Amino acid sequence: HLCGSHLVEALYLVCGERGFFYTP
Amino acid sequence: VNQHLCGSHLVEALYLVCGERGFFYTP
Amino acid sequence: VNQHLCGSHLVEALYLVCGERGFFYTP
Amino acid sequence: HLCGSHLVEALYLVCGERGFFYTP
Amino acid sequence: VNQHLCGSHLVEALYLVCGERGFFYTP
Amino acid sequence: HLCGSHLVEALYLVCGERGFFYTP
Amino acid sequence: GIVEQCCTSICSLYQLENYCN
Amino acid sequence: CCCSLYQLENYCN
Amino acid sequence: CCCSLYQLENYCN
Amino acid sequence: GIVEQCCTSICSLYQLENYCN
Amino acid sequence: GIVEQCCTSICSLYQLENYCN
Amino acid sequence: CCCSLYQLENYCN
Ligand SMILES: NCCc1c[nH]c2ccc(O)cc12
Ligand SMILES: NCCc1c[nH]c2ccc(O)cc12
Ligand SMILES: NCCc1c[nH]c2ccc(O)cc12
Ligand SMILES: NC(=[NH2+])NCCC[C@H](N)C(=O)O
Ligand SMILES: NC(=[NH2+])NCCC[C@H](N)C(=O)O
Ligand SMILES: NC(=[NH2+])NCCC[C@H](N)C(=O)O
Ligand SMILES: [Cl-]
Ligand SMILES: [Cl-]
Ligand SMILES: [Zn+2]
Ligand SMILES: [Zn+2]
């Protein structure tokens, strides 16, 4: 379903305002 | 806002730049 | 225009938000 | 060839001005 | 700048438009 | 690792200022 | 619709969901 | 599709 | 994930 | 080229195709 | 951080790398 | 490639 830069794109749609870590 | 659209491009850039390490984004 | 570039980001957002339902985009 | 958000990106390059439905 | 962000969208557009031929981008 | 429009996205992060050819 | 609304103010996942089928 | 750019034009408004 | 949009919300700040 | 043209006016699939090899 | 810096001036792969873990 | 970011730099102008 969500891999590589698509997972980061998915994270940014939800958290783009709150911010986040991406720690593979 | 052109900052939000911008952030979209930054996170994709960090994905590629940072690799196995990963990153923190916090606007 | 920053509206067209914007629309690019909206449709990708609707893709993910809408899922199996799908969406209509109409600028 | 064109799957997931790449298909939507493909649809937006052609129809981004005319608009469209995306009904999987 | 909204030109750089723009260029991002252009190259993705050329990818799809140009196909097997390919393209040159030069800002 | 990098295929289709992801390869072009990768090329643009490095060369987006210098410019480039994409000749598959 | 979605342009005039969501490309002036940053929309939310509620404002975006109104354009789903 | 998972077609072409020109075939995709069939889906616009 | 390679999950959902709502499950993804677990990772924000 | 493509920047100055296509990042001021919205280009078309004709204006974009001139940068193909 | 990264917004205020990197969405005013075009950043470099050095300026971007400071937000890696 | 379908390589690295640094190897990709070989293709710029
Ligand atoms: N909650 C932020 C939703 C979101 C993600 N990407 C976007 C782009 C434009 C917009 O109005 C909204 C968004
Ligand atoms: N027919 C619209 C072509 C198109 C798609 N994305 C674009 C981005 C910039 C631009 O000038 C043009 C485009
Ligand atoms: N060396 C250009 C790095 C880069 C790629 N995409 C970007 C987007 C925003 C930015 O500030 C910087 C970038
Ligand atoms: N706008 C986006 N990047 N959406 C996510 C697309 C998911 C994609 N099909 C994948 O390979 O994981
Ligand atoms: N700019 C774009 N999103 N282009 C479409 C890329 C197609 C991609 N190789 C796929 O998995 O279907
Ligand atoms: N921001 C980007 N487009 N990054 C490149 C993503 C690579 C992707 N996982 C692929 O299928 O090749
Ligand atoms: Cl943008
Ligand atoms: Cl993919
Ligand atoms: Zn953009
Ligand atoms: Zn992909």
Numbering used by the authors:
A (entry chain B), D (entry chain B), F (entry chain B): 5 to 28
B (entry chain D), C (entry chain D), E (entry chain D): 2 to 28
G (entry chain C), J (entry chain C), K (entry chain C): 1 to 21
H (entry chain A), I (entry chain A), L (entry chain A): 6 to 7, 11 to 21
From the publication, what sentences describe this entry?
Insulin is one of the key human protein hormones that is responsible for the maintenance of metabolic homeostasis, with an influence on cell proliferation and regulation of aging. Insulin is a 51-amino acid protein consisting of two disulfide-linked chains (A1-A21, B1-B30) and exerts its functions through binding as a monomer to the (αβ)2 heterodimer tyrosine-kinase-type insulin receptor (IR)5 (10, 11). Insulin is produced from a single chain pro-insulin and stored in pancreatic β-cells in storage granules (termed large dense core vesicles (LDCVs)) from which it is released into the bloodstream in response to elevated blood glucose levels. The in vitro data showed that insulin hexamers can be grouped into three structurally distinct states/families: T6, T3Rf3, and R6 (15, 16), which differ by the conformation of the B1-B6 N termini of the hormone B-chain.
A similar set of crystallization conditions yielded crystals of insulin in a ternary complex with serotonin and arginine (referred to here as InsSerArgT3R3). Despite their similarity, two of these forms (f1, f2) (referred to as InsSerArgf1-T3R3 and InsSerArgf2-T3R3) are reported here due to a dynamic (i.e. with high level of disorder) nature of Arg/insulin binding, hence the need for more independent structural evidence about the nature of these interactions. Despite the presence of arginine, the serotonin modes of binding in sites I are practically the same as in the Ins-Ser complex. Some serotonins in site III are bound in a fashion observed in InsSerT3R3; however, some of these ligands are flipped in both InsSerArgT3R3 crystal forms, i.e. the -OH and aminoethyl groups switch their positions. Arginine is accommodated there in channels within the T3 trimer, parallel to the hexamer 3-fold axis and opposite to R3 trimer sites I filled by serotonin, which leads to filling the voids around Zn2+ and His-B10. The flexibility of arginine is concentrated mostly around its -CαNH2COO− moieties, which form weak alternative HB to main chain groups of CysB7 and HisB5, also exhibiting some flipping around the Cα atom. In contrast, the guanidinium groups of the arginines are firmly engaged in extensive networks of HBs, which link them with side chains of GluB13, the side- and main-chain of HisB10, and the side chain of SerB9. This simultaneous binding of the two very different ligands to the T3R3 insulin hexamer polarizes this oligomer even further into two structurally distinct trimers, Arg3T3 and Ser6R3.
